[PDB]
Every structure is written in structure tokens, then in C-alpha cells.
Design goal:
The complex is a heterodimer of chains A (221) and B (129).
Chain A lengths: L3 E4 L2 E4 L5 E7 L7 E6 L6 E5 L3 E2 L7 E6 L2 E6 L8 E7 L6 E2 L3 E5 L3 E5 L3 E2 L5 E8 L8 E6 L5 E7 L5 E3 L7 E6 L4 E6 L8 E7 L9 E5 L3
Parallel strand pairs in A: 2-11, 13-21
Antiparallel strand pairs in A: 1-3, 3-8, 4-5, 4-9, 5-6, 7-8, 9-10, 9-11, 12-14, 14-19, 15-16, 15-20, 16-17, 18-19, 20-21
Chain B lengths: L4 H10 L10 H12 L6 E3 L5 E3 L4 E2 L29 H11 L9 H6 L15
Antiparallel strand pairs in B: 1-2, 2-3
Protein name (chain B): Lysozyme C
Pfam family, one (chain B): Lys
Function (chain B): Lysozymes have primarily a bacteriolytic function; those in tissues and body fluids are associated with the monocyte-macrophage system and enhance the activity of immunoagents. Has bacteriolytic activity against M.luteus.
Chain lengths: 221, 129
Amino acid sequence: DIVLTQSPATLSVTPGNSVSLSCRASQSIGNNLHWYQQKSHESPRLLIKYASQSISGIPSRFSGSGSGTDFTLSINSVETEDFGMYFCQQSNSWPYTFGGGTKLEITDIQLQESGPSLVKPSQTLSLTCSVTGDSITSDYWSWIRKFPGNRLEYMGYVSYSGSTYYNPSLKSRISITRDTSKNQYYLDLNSVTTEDTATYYCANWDGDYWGQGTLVTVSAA
Amino acid sequence: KVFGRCELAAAMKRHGLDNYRGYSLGNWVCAAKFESNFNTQATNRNTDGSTDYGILQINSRWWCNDGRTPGSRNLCNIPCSALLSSDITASVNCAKKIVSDGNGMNAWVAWRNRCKGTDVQAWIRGCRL
């Protein structure tokens, strides 16, 4: 797997000052490095795609640079609203992987997840994403989860042919399906352990549209 | 814009298409030659009313909106006109979505016919990348 190393782990800054967040990759990934901001339990928001390409609606002060194995997110004069975690993600190679994150400290279509909040070890976790505003046949659809220590894992996606991609770390326990007549797609994760305690997100593959996230706790209770 | 072979090879490398999802660089140069002859502004109208756009002849029935195509699905969420730019950014981005399906580069007929199973790396030789 491609390992993405972010530094610094945390950064404190005064408004009006500028910052540079580094992401380096264990192998060459071309321009296929995307940047997310995530605020204390909301869905990630895509800021920069393909190393340097601007996203509509994202403020001018964010820019990205780099290529190959070396990448930088720059904030040209930080504002108080810019507090949060910053994650890089590669899309060069399956499985997609995220960096470990950088805590910045400052001194149409809708998706909706549904599922249990509490499950028992070794049961099947089943989640639904309900899509509003377009047909599910008109995009690729993803599942992502965030472990309690801020770790992000790209679980899988289903594309137009119905072909699926699953993170190998999940060892065949995952299934992603669609129901066109209901405009829903699904995640099933078998034989859950306490290692599967996470916040789960649905998202389109493009990374533009995210659900709100749903915390699932696996407990012997 | 009409690219030279090595000029496009270099541009495609800068746009992260060397080794994207298991496909080496030559695949993309080879595809561009046989689809559009390296011309970003190429268009081709089909019997079904859809049109192919750009350096990789991406089809409006599936991938982009041209306002003219019957059961069009706009999977790349882009006007087809964006695929005509001399800046290849949008064609590359949409190509990457297309290829991230299990069909891979088999989506392009010209690639299957002219490139798949050949010495694709021949398309990038003689180039200062």
C-alpha cells in the first residue's frame, strides 16, 4: 500500500500568518494527491484535487503544489475558520490511502447514512446510503470510515459496470451493493470486532458529496 | 490545440497518467493518437445522437453533458465543451474516472483495437519526459 506521511502532526498559528503542510508518499503518485479539511466530527471537505487543482467554492487562500512523492498544502494568510484536521489522500493506486493528518490550531444531491449505533462482536454491520437529487446509476459510490484516533480508511466503491473495489485490509468481510429502484446503496461488514468501531461515511467517488457520518460502536454489550 | 507525440507524453506525465491505476504512460499516448490524432478539439458525431469530445474522444451518452444527447448520464459531471480545451486537465480527470471502473481502458475501442497487447511503451520512446 502507498503510505502517506504528513508533517507536522500539529500546528499552532495566529490568523493572518501563512502555513505549509507537507505530505510525502512511499512511492511515486504523479499528481494524484487530494487535500481534505475535517472539523471535529463532520464529513471531510475536499479543498484541492490532483495536487494543485482548485475546487469551486473553496477560498483562494488554499493552494497546493508538488508531484511524484512530495506535496504541499499552502494557506496564504490563515483565518480562524481554518482550524481542523488536514488530510492528504492518494488515488493513484487501489487501495486509496489517507495521510495521518495535521491538526491546525488557530490562536442537487444529498446523502444520508442509516444503520445501527451499537453492534455486538461477530455480527454483520449493515449500512444504507440514501441518495437524493440524482439516480445512483449516474455516479460511483464510496464508503469511508474514521477510527477513534483520527485514522481514515477508504473501504470501497462501486462503479458504473457494478465492479467493486474493496480495501484488502478488510479481508473479504465487506460487500458493497446497490438498489436502483430505492436509490440506495449498501455496506455490509461481516464478523465485526471492536477494531471496527468507527464513524462511517458514504460519499460519491468524486469526493464532492458526503453523508454526515454515523458512529458505530462494537461492544460486547 | 494539436499536440506532438512527445509533447503530449510530457503533458500526460505532468497530469499523473504514468502508472495511474495499473496503466503505463504509453497506453494514454497510443489512445490519444488513434482516437483524435492528438487534437484536443476533435469531435465526432455518432448515429445514436451522442458525440465524442476531445483528445480521448469521450462520449456524451455517458460521461459529459452536451445538451443534445437522449439518455445522457453525465458521469464526469462536466460540460462536453470542457473536454475541448487546449488545457487537457478535464479530459485527463474524466479519463481517470472512466478507467477507475473495472472495464479499465477497454472503454476506448481504438485502444482495444490498436494499443492493447502491443508495445505501448514505444509511444513514449525518443521523448525527454
